[PDB]
């Protein structure tokens, strides 16, 4: 389970010596955005969509990656390769840089990191989590920045009330995602529902859709009034790590009897098959 | 104008050795605190004040400084005297530390990085100058946090606008400052105001706002409406860096000829009055 190496700016690095300059913008400024993305079987799972996000992310912060797709796909291989590992975590970094005057990206650097599966990973447990509510709308909310400060900050009240997550609820009244994942209800006539506007586009939250759609269940991308968690059978959320984890709880509501839902459950299967049929090209 | 030194975690090290280790949680989560300050006659300016601030930054964020500040004061003076400089601008970082997993807040990393005194400190320009409205409100107004994601994303849009700063407009309805900078307005009777929620409390706008008073200026601190832009007479800038800087222009109104009113610049007198003052107790 050991990781060598992490590669920064193209170089392949002994993770010990892999370190940035403290005038790099991500130290000073926050600035940066990041993608993240599991391999299976020696492959990135559904890379091209993370490249593509990752690439969408960096325009918006009008960051230009050094490397182009083909090289960057390249450089991640080799990465797994030096790591001797075909199961693993891959985390890519884009920072505005070291900046002359603490405030202006000049030249972005780029960081990719490598980490065991995590434990967790696709645990699919059939006991949902329990989540609390939480008034908040994320900044740029369609670009994945390295912003977190609100998601982590509310680690200590997550846990002080016996949850293990949150749903952020714009203005307390239109539901969007958590911190790290999608969020998916799914009501008593089968109809699946997300929200569509103000949240990032996850890839797993892309494949559940698609995956759900072909099955056959009509999938609404709309907005979501908080009070419609009261008309929901099922509530579950999508992550790069998650994979589909149902929610047995949120706030006062048990969702069922707290374990996964049917259509959870079949998800949970189906998107499972999108990583096969994915890694059957590969 | 040479800086030979920064600190890290209480050791001095040479500039180009100070380095963090890429698993640090500001460079993965953006997630820190920081102030600013300048020294001039080798002190730091209002330093009490500063320190209370970062102090208090850190404890809402739930970082802890590794240091009281008895002994962060000691290394920060420490730290002037390395460098043989007696101007400075000085910025101190606290970021979430080196996470296990890339999330959770382990042990925070302290910087102290140091500049040369800013070749535009305090300039007071007698030409105002143009910015532009924006509509956003910033998170965690009152935490001098490290995220400054919307505030460097929108240097291309005021740039290509003509413009050289904005004023962010909460929902474009309520005035609250800069990326960098307190905003305050004086009105045709001189009664200055400034707003007083979800904004950072300014250490700058702290002096200024004593200031006006002890001149007996009334300074009302509320919510200011974006149509009180047009009954205002004047309005400025507060910051570290700027002292007090006059703003000539919004969008498309010019205050007075766009040259600093007369409250402005007899506040830019009485801010130095504060430097002096506060000076001659070091
Ligand atoms: C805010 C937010 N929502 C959701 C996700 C899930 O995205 P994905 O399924 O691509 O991991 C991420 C990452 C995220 O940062
Ligand atoms: C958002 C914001 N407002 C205003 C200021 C000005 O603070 P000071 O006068 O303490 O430099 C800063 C720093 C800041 O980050």
């Not at 955005?33 to 960096?58: C, K, M, T, V």
């Not at 839902?261 to 049929?277: I, M, S």
């Amino acid at each position: 389970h050991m990781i060598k190496y992490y590669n920064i700016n193209g170089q392949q690095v002994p993770v010990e010596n892999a370190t940035l300059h403290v005038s790099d913008l991500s130290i000073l400024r926050g600035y940066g955005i990041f993608d993240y993305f599991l391999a299976r079987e020696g492959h990135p799972l559904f890379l091209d969509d993370y490249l593509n996000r990752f690439y969408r992310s960096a325009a918006e912060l009008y960051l230009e990656i050094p490397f182009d797709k083909a090289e960057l796909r390249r450089q991640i291989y080799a990465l797994l390769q030096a790591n001797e590992v075909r199961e693993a975590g891959i985390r890519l970094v884009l920072t505005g840089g070291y900046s002359p005057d603490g405030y202006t990206p000049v030249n972005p650097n780029l960081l990719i990191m490598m980490y065991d599966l995590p434990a967790s990973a696709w645990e699919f447990s059939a006991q949902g989590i329990k989540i609390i509510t939480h008034p908040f709308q994320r900044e740029l909310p369609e670009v994945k920045t390295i912003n977190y400060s609100t998601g982590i900050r509310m680690l200590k009240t997550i846990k002080e009330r016996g949850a293990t997550d949150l749903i952020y609820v714009d203005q307390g009244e239109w539901i969007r995602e958590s911190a790290r994942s999608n969020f998916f209800l799914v009501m008593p006539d089968n109809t699946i529902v997300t929200a569509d506007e103000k949240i990032l586009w996850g890839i797993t939250r892309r494949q559940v859709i698609d995956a759900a759609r072909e099955a056959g269940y009509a999938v609404e991308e709309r907005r979501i009034h908080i009070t419609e968690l009261d008309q929901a059978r099922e509530a579950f959320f999508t992550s790069t790590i998650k994979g589909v984890m149902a929610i047995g709880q949120i706030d006062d509501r048990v969702f069922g009897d707290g374990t996964i839902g049917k259509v959870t459950q079949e998800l949970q299967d189906l998107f499972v098959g999108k990583v096969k049929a994915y890694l059957e090209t590969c």
